[PDB]
Design a protein around this ligand. Structure first.
Ligand code: HEM
Ligand code: HEM
Ligand code: HEM
Ligand code: HEM
Ligand code: ARS
Ligand code: ARS
Ligand code: ARS
Ligand code: ZN
Ligand code: ZN
Ligand code: ZN
Ligand code: ZN
Length: 103
């Protein structure tokens, strides 16, 4: 993911909003995220694996557009992960057009 500059959007089909800005490797460095499974997590039978990750598997392989039980749909998964951390840490973009940048 060194060439990533926005979050993948093909799984959404027609977009409402601009692709979310996300230079993956520069973001993770600036945010000080060392564990890949901060995002690329492995949930099995309601248990979060502490020492595994799902690097290489798209979020959309496990997160349909619609919610399934307590597995969030794909929009909700991104918002909870991305906007959820920014709100928890009080750092990074928490307004809609600061992620979904019109440029
Ligand atoms: C989820 C894929 C996700 C997105 C999208 C996202 C975007 C984002 C931007 C565009 C910035 C500003 C520029 C930059 O890349 O530094 C930013 C900044 C921070 N983020 Fe973020 N972010 C996503 C996810 C996450 C997650 C899961 C965390 C916390 C675990 C996280 C944290 C942060 C932090 C901290 C910052 C500030 C960086 C700095 O300038 O200090 N983000 N994010
Ligand atoms: C930990 C250092 C880490 C690794 C390693 C890593 C790898 C990685 C790859 C190989 C991909 C796919 C790139 C491609 O398609 O060419 C990828 C994609 C995404 N990642 Fe990642 N990633 C690591 C860490 C993190 C962290 C900490 C976050 C959350 C802030 C994160 C996020 C994402 C997202 C979003 C994508 C796109 C997923 C998709 O659906 O294709 N990664 N990562
Ligand atoms: C891709 C980086 C990706 C994102 C974004 C994402 C988000 C996400 C959230 C925010 C939740 C809610 C719980 C939590 O905060 O962790 C969640 C829940 C589930 N996930 Fe996920 N997820 C991403 C990637 C993946 C991948 C690649 C898998 C499949 C291997 C996956 C699976 C799941 C499952 C299952 C859940 C539900 C957990 C539970 O409550 O039982 N995620 N995801
Ligand atoms: C502010 C409340 C806000 C809105 C509105 C919004 C909308 C939105 C939609 C409708 C989607 C689905 C795809 C589409 O464009 O149709 C979506 C997807 C993602 N979002 Fe978002 N979003 C708002 C807020 C935020 C913030 C503050 C962030 C960044 C932390 C963010 C990120 C993302 C990501 C990642 C996705 C999936 C990939 C993409 O579509 O770019 N959103 N959002
Ligand atoms: As670097
Ligand atoms: As929120
Ligand atoms: As809250
Ligand atoms: Zn390189
Ligand atoms: Zn851009
Ligand atoms: Zn750098
Ligand atoms: Zn790993």
């Amino acid at each position: 993911x060194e060439d990533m500059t926005h979050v993948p959007t093909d799984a959404f089909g027609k977009l409402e909003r601009p692709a979310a800005v996300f230079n993956h490797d520069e973001h993770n460095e600036k945010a000080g995220i060392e564990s890949c499974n901060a995002c690329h997590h492995v949930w099995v039978n309601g248990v979060l694996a502490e020492d595994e990750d799902s690097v290489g598997t798209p979020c959309s392989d496990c997160h349909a557009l619609e919610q399934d039980g307590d597995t969030p749909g794909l929009q909700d998964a991104y918002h909870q992960q991305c906007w959820g951390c920014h709100e928890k840490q009080a750092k990074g973009p928490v307004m809609c057009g600061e992620c979904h940048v019109k440029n």
